[PDB]
Short mmCIF file of C-alpha atoms and ligand atoms in Angstrom, two decimals:
data_model
loop_
_atom_site.label_atom_id
_atom_site.label_comp_id
_atom_site.label_asym_id
_atom_site.label_seq_id
_atom_site.Cartn_x
_atom_site.Cartn_y
_atom_site.Cartn_z
CA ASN A 24 -4.73 -30.93 47.86
CA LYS A 25 -5.44 -28.16 44.76
CA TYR A 26 -3.83 -25.25 47.88
CA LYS A 27 -1.83 -26.52 51.06
CA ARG A 28 -2.93 -23.45 52.97
CA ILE A 29 -5.88 -20.92 52.80
CA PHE A 30 -5.56 -17.77 54.16
CA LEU A 31 -9.20 -16.60 54.84
CA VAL A 32 -9.97 -12.53 56.10
CA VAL A 33 -12.67 -11.33 56.98
CA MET A 34 -12.87 -7.54 56.89
CA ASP A 35 -15.50 -7.21 59.56
CA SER A 36 -18.56 -5.42 58.66
CA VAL A 37 -17.32 -4.59 55.18
CA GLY A 38 -20.45 -4.69 53.13
CA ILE A 39 -20.82 -3.45 49.41
CA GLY A 40 -24.05 -2.77 49.08
CA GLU A 41 -27.41 -3.17 50.18
CA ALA A 42 -28.68 -6.91 49.69
CA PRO A 43 -31.61 -7.97 47.97
CA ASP A 44 -33.70 -8.44 51.74
CA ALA A 45 -32.41 -5.20 52.67
CA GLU A 46 -35.65 -3.55 53.12
CA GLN A 47 -37.32 -6.10 55.48
CA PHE A 48 -34.20 -5.22 58.01
CA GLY A 49 -34.92 -1.19 57.68
CA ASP A 50 -31.45 -1.11 55.19
CA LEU A 51 -32.88 0.39 52.02
CA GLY A 52 -29.93 2.89 50.65
CA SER A 53 -26.92 1.11 53.09
CA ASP A 54 -23.86 0.72 51.13
CA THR A 55 -20.68 0.66 53.63
CA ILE A 56 -17.92 0.88 51.18
CA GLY A 57 -19.57 3.16 48.80
CA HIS A 58 -20.65 5.71 51.65
CA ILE A 59 -17.22 5.36 52.78
CA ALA A 60 -15.67 6.32 49.89
CA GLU A 61 -17.95 8.96 48.91
CA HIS A 62 -17.29 10.77 52.18
CA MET A 63 -13.20 10.12 51.77
CA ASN A 64 -13.71 12.04 48.23
CA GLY A 65 -12.33 8.89 46.65
CA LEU A 66 -10.72 5.63 49.16
CA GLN A 67 -7.26 5.00 48.48
CA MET A 68 -7.41 1.01 48.45
CA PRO A 69 -4.81 0.29 45.43
CA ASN A 70 -3.96 -3.11 46.40
CA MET A 71 -7.81 -3.99 47.08
CA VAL A 72 -8.54 -2.66 43.68
CA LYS A 73 -5.74 -4.47 41.86
CA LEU A 74 -7.01 -7.58 43.02
CA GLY A 75 -10.36 -6.83 41.50
CA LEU A 76 -12.73 -5.01 44.05
CA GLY A 77 -13.77 -2.34 41.81
CA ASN A 78 -14.01 -5.44 38.84
CA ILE A 79 -17.17 -5.76 42.25
CA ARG A 80 -18.55 -2.45 42.26
CA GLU A 81 -16.94 0.36 41.11
CA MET A 82 -17.04 3.35 43.85
CA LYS A 83 -15.30 7.15 44.16
CA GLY A 84 -11.45 6.00 44.44
CA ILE A 85 -12.23 2.45 43.54
CA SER A 86 -12.08 1.69 40.03
CA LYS A 87 -11.94 -1.88 37.85
CA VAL A 88 -8.98 -2.95 36.28
CA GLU A 89 -7.99 -4.72 32.98
CA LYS A 90 -6.51 -7.65 34.59
CA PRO A 91 -7.21 -8.03 38.37
CA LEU A 92 -5.03 -10.13 40.07
CA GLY A 93 -7.90 -13.31 41.01
CA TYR A 94 -11.15 -13.63 41.03
CA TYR A 95 -14.40 -11.13 42.03
CA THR A 96 -17.22 -11.28 42.97
CA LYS A 97 -19.87 -10.74 45.86
CA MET A 98 -21.86 -13.03 48.05
CA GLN A 99 -25.74 -12.56 49.36
CA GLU A 100 -26.46 -14.01 53.12
CA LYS A 101 -29.17 -16.54 53.10
CA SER A 102 -29.43 -16.44 57.00
CA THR A 103 -32.04 -14.60 58.72
CA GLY A 104 -29.99 -12.34 60.89
CA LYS A 105 -27.44 -9.32 60.06
CA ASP A 106 -25.01 -10.37 63.14
CA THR A 107 -21.11 -11.36 63.53
CA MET A 108 -22.39 -14.72 64.41
CA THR A 109 -24.72 -15.45 62.12
CA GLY A 110 -22.35 -13.96 59.01
CA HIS A 111 -19.27 -16.35 60.27
CA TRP A 112 -21.41 -19.47 61.15
CA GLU A 113 -22.67 -19.09 57.53
CA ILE A 114 -19.33 -18.62 56.16
CA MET A 115 -18.46 -22.11 57.41
CA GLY A 116 -20.91 -23.75 56.10
CA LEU A 117 -24.12 -23.04 57.96
CA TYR A 118 -27.45 -22.04 57.89
CA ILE A 119 -28.99 -20.13 60.73
CA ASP A 120 -32.67 -19.65 60.59
CA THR A 121 -33.01 -17.70 64.01
CA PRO A 122 -31.46 -14.14 64.38
CA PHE A 123 -29.34 -12.80 67.50
CA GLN A 124 -31.19 -9.77 68.63
CA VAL A 125 -29.59 -6.57 69.73
CA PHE A 126 -31.43 -4.13 73.13
CA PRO A 127 -31.49 -0.75 71.90
CA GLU A 128 -33.83 -0.06 74.61
CA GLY A 129 -32.66 -2.65 77.08
CA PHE A 130 -34.18 -5.98 77.77
CA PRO A 131 -37.56 -7.24 78.05
CA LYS A 132 -38.75 -6.88 81.63
CA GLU A 133 -39.46 -11.15 81.42
CA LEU A 134 -36.03 -12.02 81.26
CA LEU A 135 -34.46 -9.34 83.97
CA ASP A 136 -37.45 -10.54 85.73
CA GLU A 137 -36.16 -14.55 85.75
CA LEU A 138 -32.28 -13.25 86.31
CA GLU A 139 -33.28 -11.94 89.46
CA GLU A 140 -35.52 -14.40 90.36
CA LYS A 141 -32.58 -17.18 90.05
CA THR A 142 -29.62 -15.05 91.43
CA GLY A 143 -31.68 -13.28 94.44
CA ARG A 144 -29.83 -10.24 93.25
CA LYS A 145 -31.42 -6.74 91.87
CA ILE A 146 -30.57 -5.51 88.15
CA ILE A 147 -29.73 -1.92 87.88
CA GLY A 148 -29.36 0.01 84.41
CA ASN A 149 -30.56 -2.06 82.05
CA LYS A 150 -29.37 0.17 78.98
CA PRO A 151 -26.96 0.52 76.01
CA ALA A 152 -23.97 2.08 77.30
CA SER A 153 -20.06 2.50 77.09
CA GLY A 154 -18.36 -0.35 79.91
CA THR A 155 -16.74 3.01 81.41
CA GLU A 156 -19.49 5.30 81.52
CA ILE A 157 -22.05 2.84 82.83
CA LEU A 158 -19.59 2.54 86.05
CA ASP A 159 -19.20 6.31 86.69
CA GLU A 160 -23.10 6.30 86.73
CA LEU A 161 -23.94 3.60 88.71
CA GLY A 162 -20.54 1.51 90.25
CA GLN A 163 -21.25 3.17 93.77
CA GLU A 164 -24.78 2.24 93.64
CA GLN A 165 -23.28 -1.26 92.89
CA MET A 166 -21.06 -1.34 95.59
CA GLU A 167 -23.48 -0.10 98.15
CA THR A 168 -26.41 -2.88 97.21
CA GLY A 169 -24.63 -5.93 95.92
CA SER A 170 -26.94 -5.20 92.52
CA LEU A 171 -25.63 -6.57 89.40
CA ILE A 172 -25.14 -3.66 86.57
CA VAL A 173 -26.52 -5.21 83.71
CA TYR A 174 -26.48 -3.33 80.09
CA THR A 175 -25.89 -3.64 76.74
CA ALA A 176 -23.79 -1.96 73.13
CA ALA A 177 -24.73 -1.84 69.80
CA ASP A 178 -24.38 -5.29 69.19
CA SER A 179 -25.67 -8.50 70.53
CA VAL A 180 -24.40 -8.70 73.77
CA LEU A 181 -25.81 -8.99 77.82
CA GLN A 182 -23.09 -7.57 79.73
CA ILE A 183 -23.09 -7.88 83.74
CA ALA A 184 -20.63 -5.54 85.60
CA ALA A 185 -20.38 -6.10 89.77
CA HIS A 186 -17.28 -4.87 91.82
CA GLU A 187 -14.86 -7.84 92.70
CA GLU A 188 -14.87 -6.93 96.50
CA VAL A 189 -18.51 -6.83 96.31
CA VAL A 190 -19.57 -9.60 94.47
CA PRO A 191 -16.93 -12.38 94.60
CA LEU A 192 -15.60 -13.60 90.83
CA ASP A 193 -16.84 -17.04 90.87
CA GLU A 194 -20.64 -15.43 91.63
CA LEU A 195 -20.48 -13.13 89.06
CA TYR A 196 -19.32 -16.27 86.66
CA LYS A 197 -22.48 -18.36 88.29
CA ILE A 198 -24.53 -15.78 87.48
CA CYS A 199 -23.01 -15.15 83.61
CA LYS A 200 -23.98 -18.70 83.24
CA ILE A 201 -27.29 -18.17 84.66
CA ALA A 202 -27.80 -15.06 81.90
CA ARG A 203 -26.34 -17.66 79.16
CA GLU A 204 -29.16 -19.91 80.05
CA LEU A 205 -32.07 -17.75 80.16
CA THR A 206 -30.58 -16.35 76.76
CA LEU A 207 -30.85 -19.08 74.53
CA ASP A 208 -34.60 -18.29 73.79
CA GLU A 209 -35.41 -16.64 70.63
CA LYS A 210 -37.91 -14.43 72.50
CA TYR A 211 -34.37 -12.65 73.59
CA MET A 212 -31.90 -14.40 71.87
CA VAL A 213 -28.28 -12.74 72.78
CA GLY A 214 -24.94 -13.28 71.20
CA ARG A 215 -22.80 -13.10 74.16
CA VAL A 216 -22.98 -12.76 78.07
CA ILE A 217 -20.01 -11.06 79.07
CA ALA A 218 -18.83 -10.74 82.77
CA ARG A 219 -17.66 -7.30 83.55
CA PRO A 220 -15.90 -7.94 87.12
CA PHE A 221 -14.27 -4.15 88.11
CA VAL A 222 -12.33 -2.93 91.35
CA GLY A 223 -11.64 0.71 92.85
CA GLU A 224 -13.81 3.64 94.48
CA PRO A 225 -16.35 6.14 92.74
CA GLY A 226 -14.57 8.39 90.35
CA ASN A 227 -11.86 5.59 89.54
CA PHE A 228 -13.21 2.48 88.51
CA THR A 229 -11.17 -0.08 86.60
CA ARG A 230 -12.37 -3.33 84.70
CA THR A 231 -10.17 -6.27 85.17
CA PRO A 232 -8.80 -8.85 83.19
CA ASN A 233 -10.87 -11.25 85.00
CA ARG A 234 -13.45 -10.58 81.89
CA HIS A 235 -15.34 -13.60 80.82
CA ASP A 236 -17.54 -14.28 77.24
CA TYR A 237 -19.90 -16.54 77.28
CA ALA A 238 -20.70 -17.58 73.68
CA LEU A 239 -22.69 -20.09 71.95
CA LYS A 240 -21.62 -22.96 70.18
CA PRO A 241 -22.68 -22.75 66.40
CA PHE A 242 -25.52 -24.30 65.57
CA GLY A 243 -24.58 -26.89 63.69
CA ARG A 244 -20.92 -28.72 63.10
CA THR A 245 -18.67 -26.66 60.66
CA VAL A 246 -15.90 -26.94 58.19
CA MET A 247 -13.61 -25.92 60.82
CA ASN A 248 -14.90 -28.62 62.64
CA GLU A 249 -14.19 -31.30 59.89
CA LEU A 250 -10.88 -29.75 59.28
CA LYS A 251 -9.89 -30.13 62.90
CA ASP A 252 -11.29 -33.76 63.04
CA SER A 253 -9.00 -34.58 59.91
CA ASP A 254 -5.94 -33.33 61.35
CA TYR A 255 -5.80 -30.01 59.76
CA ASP A 256 -4.23 -26.83 61.07
CA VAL A 257 -7.02 -24.22 61.87
CA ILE A 258 -5.31 -20.88 63.01
CA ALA A 259 -7.78 -18.67 64.37
CA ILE A 260 -6.22 -15.02 64.34
CA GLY A 261 -8.64 -12.52 66.43
CA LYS A 262 -12.10 -12.85 67.35
CA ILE A 263 -12.61 -15.71 65.37
CA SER A 264 -11.99 -18.56 68.27
CA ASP A 265 -14.67 -16.43 70.13
CA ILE A 266 -17.06 -16.41 67.46
CA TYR A 267 -17.01 -20.18 66.85
CA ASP A 268 -16.66 -20.65 70.52
CA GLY A 269 -13.27 -22.55 70.06
CA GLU A 270 -15.18 -24.78 67.64
CA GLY A 271 -12.82 -26.60 65.06
CA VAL A 272 -9.62 -24.41 66.37
CA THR A 273 -6.09 -25.78 66.37
CA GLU A 274 -4.40 -22.39 67.67
CA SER A 275 -5.52 -18.95 68.42
CA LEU A 276 -3.83 -15.91 68.03
CA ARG A 277 -5.05 -13.04 69.75
CA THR A 278 -5.02 -9.72 68.09
CA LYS A 279 -5.34 -5.84 69.65
CA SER A 280 -5.95 -3.70 66.54
CA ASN A 281 -6.57 -4.25 62.98
CA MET A 282 -2.82 -3.60 62.29
CA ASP A 283 -1.80 -6.47 64.81
CA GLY A 284 -4.22 -8.71 63.14
CA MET A 285 -2.25 -8.31 59.81
CA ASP A 286 1.04 -8.88 61.50
CA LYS A 287 -0.54 -12.33 62.93
CA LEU A 288 -1.56 -13.05 59.49
CA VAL A 289 2.19 -12.64 58.44
CA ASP A 290 2.99 -14.93 61.40
CA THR A 291 1.01 -17.35 59.85
CA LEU A 292 2.48 -16.98 55.87
CA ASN A 293 5.78 -17.71 58.15
CA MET A 294 4.11 -20.90 59.39
CA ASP A 295 4.79 -24.72 58.23
CA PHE A 296 1.01 -25.28 58.25
CA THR A 297 -1.52 -27.15 55.94
CA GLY A 298 -4.82 -26.04 56.55
CA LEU A 299 -6.85 -22.83 57.01
CA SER A 300 -5.37 -19.58 58.70
CA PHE A 301 -8.61 -17.54 59.47
CA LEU A 302 -8.55 -13.68 60.57
CA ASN A 303 -11.17 -11.41 61.55
CA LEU A 304 -10.33 -7.64 61.43
CA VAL A 305 -12.86 -6.26 63.89
CA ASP A 306 -11.79 -2.53 64.58
CA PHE A 307 -14.16 -1.60 61.28
CA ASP A 308 -17.00 -2.65 63.09
CA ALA A 309 -16.16 -2.08 66.66
CA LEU A 310 -14.54 1.26 66.38
CA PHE A 311 -15.95 2.96 62.98
CA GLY A 312 -19.28 1.38 61.61
CA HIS A 313 -21.49 1.20 65.16
CA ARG A 314 -19.82 4.93 66.14
CA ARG A 315 -21.47 5.70 62.72
CA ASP A 316 -17.84 7.36 61.81
CA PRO A 317 -17.03 7.22 58.59
CA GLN A 318 -13.87 9.31 58.48
CA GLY A 319 -12.39 6.69 60.86
CA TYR A 320 -13.63 3.73 58.62
CA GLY A 321 -11.94 5.49 55.61
CA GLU A 322 -9.01 6.08 56.96
CA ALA A 323 -8.79 2.53 58.67
CA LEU A 324 -9.62 0.71 55.00
CA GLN A 325 -6.45 2.53 53.78
CA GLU A 326 -4.35 1.58 56.72
CA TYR A 327 -5.18 -1.98 55.81
CA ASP A 328 -4.95 -1.51 52.22
CA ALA A 329 -1.56 -0.74 52.89
CA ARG A 330 -0.59 -3.42 54.29
CA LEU A 331 -1.54 -5.94 51.43
CA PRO A 332 1.54 -6.13 49.69
CA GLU A 333 3.74 -8.08 51.93
CA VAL A 334 0.71 -10.12 52.24
CA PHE A 335 0.93 -10.71 48.61
CA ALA A 336 4.62 -11.45 48.91
CA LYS A 337 4.42 -14.05 50.96
CA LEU A 338 1.86 -15.97 49.09
CA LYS A 339 2.91 -19.32 47.67
CA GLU A 340 1.98 -20.95 44.66
CA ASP A 341 -0.02 -23.41 46.47
CA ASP A 342 -1.63 -20.74 49.13
CA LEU A 343 -4.91 -19.34 48.66
CA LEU A 344 -5.76 -15.83 49.84
CA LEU A 345 -9.75 -15.10 50.22
CA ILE A 346 -10.81 -11.59 51.46
CA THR A 347 -14.52 -11.28 52.52
CA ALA A 348 -16.87 -9.65 55.34
CA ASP A 349 -19.67 -10.94 57.40
CA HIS A 350 -22.16 -8.37 56.67
CA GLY A 351 -22.72 -4.27 56.06
CA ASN A 352 -22.63 -1.50 59.10
CA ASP A 353 -22.70 1.69 57.20
CA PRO A 354 -21.59 4.58 59.03
CA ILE A 355 -23.46 6.76 57.13
CA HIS A 356 -27.43 4.73 58.24
CA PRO A 357 -29.75 5.63 61.02
CA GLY A 358 -29.06 4.28 64.12
CA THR A 359 -26.53 1.93 65.31
CA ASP A 360 -27.24 -1.85 64.33
CA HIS A 361 -25.34 -3.53 61.34
CA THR A 362 -27.00 -3.30 57.73
CA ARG A 363 -28.20 -6.38 55.66
CA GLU A 364 -25.76 -6.06 52.07
CA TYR A 365 -23.64 -8.13 49.81
CA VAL A 366 -20.16 -8.93 51.00
CA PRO A 367 -17.26 -8.58 48.61
CA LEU A 368 -15.43 -11.69 47.86
CA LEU A 369 -11.48 -11.75 46.39
CA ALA A 370 -9.92 -15.14 45.60
CA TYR A 371 -5.97 -14.97 44.90
CA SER A 372 -3.29 -17.17 44.12
CA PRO A 373 -0.30 -16.37 42.68
CA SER A 374 -0.44 -19.16 40.42
CA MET A 375 -3.41 -17.42 39.13
CA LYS A 376 -0.54 -16.38 36.37
CA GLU A 377 -3.21 -15.10 33.98
CA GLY A 378 -4.93 -13.11 36.83
CA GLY A 379 -8.65 -13.85 37.67
CA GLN A 380 -12.47 -13.42 36.35
CA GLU A 381 -15.65 -13.04 37.47
CA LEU A 382 -17.41 -15.72 39.88
CA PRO A 383 -21.39 -15.91 39.50
CA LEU A 384 -22.51 -14.31 42.39
CA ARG A 385 -22.30 -16.66 45.49
CA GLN A 386 -26.21 -17.45 46.67
CA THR A 387 -24.84 -18.06 50.54
CA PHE A 388 -21.91 -17.21 52.44
CA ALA A 389 -21.52 -20.76 52.67
CA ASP A 390 -19.78 -21.11 49.18
CA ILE A 391 -16.37 -20.00 51.30
CA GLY A 392 -16.96 -23.19 53.50
CA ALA A 393 -17.60 -25.29 50.54
CA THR A 394 -14.76 -24.38 48.54
CA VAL A 395 -12.07 -24.79 52.09
CA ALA A 396 -14.23 -28.00 52.24
CA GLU A 397 -13.85 -29.16 49.17
CA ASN A 398 -10.22 -28.30 48.56
CA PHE A 399 -9.23 -30.20 51.91
CA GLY A 400 -11.10 -33.15 50.81
CA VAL A 401 -13.01 -32.84 54.16
CA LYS A 402 -17.03 -33.26 54.78
CA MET A 403 -18.97 -31.10 52.87
CA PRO A 404 -21.22 -28.96 54.17
CA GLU A 405 -24.98 -28.98 53.90
CA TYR A 406 -25.08 -25.41 52.41
CA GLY A 407 -22.68 -23.50 49.96
CA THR A 408 -21.29 -24.26 46.39
CA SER A 409 -17.83 -24.57 45.87
CA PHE A 410 -15.89 -22.46 43.84
CA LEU A 411 -12.62 -24.07 43.84
CA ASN A 412 -12.97 -25.79 40.55
CA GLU A 413 -13.76 -21.99 38.82
CA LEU A 414 -10.07 -20.58 40.38
O1 HSX B 1 -16.40 -1.63 76.57
P1 HSX B 1 -17.81 -2.32 76.57
O2 HSX B 1 -18.60 -0.60 76.48
O3 HSX B 1 -18.16 -2.68 77.91
O4 HSX B 1 -18.35 -2.99 75.57
C1 HSX B 1 -18.69 -2.82 74.14
C2 HSX B 1 -18.19 -3.76 73.63
O5 HSX B 1 -16.90 -4.54 73.82
C3 HSX B 1 -16.89 -5.80 73.59
O6 HSX B 1 -16.26 -6.23 72.13
C4 HSX B 1 -18.45 -6.63 73.22
O7 HSX B 1 -18.13 -6.64 72.22
C5 HSX B 1 -19.06 -5.13 73.53
O8 HSX B 1 -20.07 -4.65 72.40
MN1 MN B 2 -30.85 0.11 59.21
MN1 MN B 3 -19.20 -8.63 62.26
MN1 MN B 4 -21.17 -5.74 64.96
#
C-alpha cells in the first residue's frame, strides 16, 4: 500500500459555497463557511488554513497560503439528494438517484393511513418537533389512548414515540419495522425510522435508552464493504456506522460531541491498524446548521481547528488524512433544510515534504472512495476517479 492508514474526516454539513445545480434545490446564495466567516468577522481556523482551506476559497479570516501542508480542491455532488446518507454513500463509491425526503408540513395522509391500517393504532402529532417538547404536548394523550406520537425533525426522519408501560417495547419495535418497510417508497422516502420509547408522567417524561434506529442499507456495496471483505480494518467513529447501517464496518466507536469525535480520532491514531479510520463530526449539522445558528457553528469550527495540531503530530509518513464534508447546511439560509453546496477536500500526509498543490475539482464525492480503494488494492467503485497518484 502507498498508505497504511487513511483517516477520513467528514465535517458534517461544512459546505464551501453553492453548487452548479443549487437553483434546482432553492439553494442559490448558499455558502456555509463563507457566511459563518462573515458572521464571525473572520473565522479563526489557522490549521485548516495551513492545510490549504483558503487555497480552495478565500473567505473572511481564511486566507490562502504559499505552501499548503497538503493537496486541496473541492468536490461536486452528483447524486440527486443533499442529505447525509446520500453524501456519505457517494463518498464511499455510490451514485444515488432517489433523494430522501424531508417533511416540514408532516407526513402525507397516505403514509399515515397505511401505518394505521397495518398497526391498528391511531397516529397523533404528525409535525416537525423537538422530541422532548412533543412528549410534553402529547405524551399524556398518548398514555390515555394507546396512540402513537409520530413526528419528524429538520432532516429525513420518522420518529415514533410511545410510553413503555402503555405500548410494550417489542410492539413499538414491530411498529417501527412496519414504518421502515412503508417508507421504502419514493412517494415518501425517509432516511431513518426511530423508535422513541419514553417513561414517566405528565410534566416529567423521560426518553429511555431503549431508542432504536432503523436505517436503510446503502444502495450498493461500498468501498467499506470491499475493505472489510479484504480483511482491512474499517473503524467507524461517531454516526458513521449508523449512516452505512454497519456495512463494511469492523469496529465502531460512539462519540457524544465533536471534541469527543476528535478524541476517538486520536485513539485510532494510537491503534495499530491497516485500513480506514472514518470520523463524522456531526455537531455542525445537528446543533448549528439546522438551528440556523451561525455563532455556535463558527465557535464549533474554531474548537475543531484548535484540535488539529495534535492530529498533525501523530500522523506517520504512511498515513493519509482526508478532510471533507457531505453537503452544506448554511446557518444563514431560509428554512431548516441542507444546502446544495460544493464541499472542501484537503489531503495531507507528513510524507508530502514539499507541501501540496491544487487537485482538479472532484466531479463526484465518489473520488474519495475511488482513492481509498486504489490505495488498498481492492475492487474499484463503479463511480469516482482516484486522486491517489496526484498525491
Ligand atoms: O431529539 P429529537 O428532537 O427527538 O430528534 C432530533 C434528532 O435526533 C436524532 O439525531 C435524529 O437525527 C433527529 O433528527
Ligand atoms: Mn435552500
Ligand atoms: Mn450530513
Ligand atoms: Mn442534517
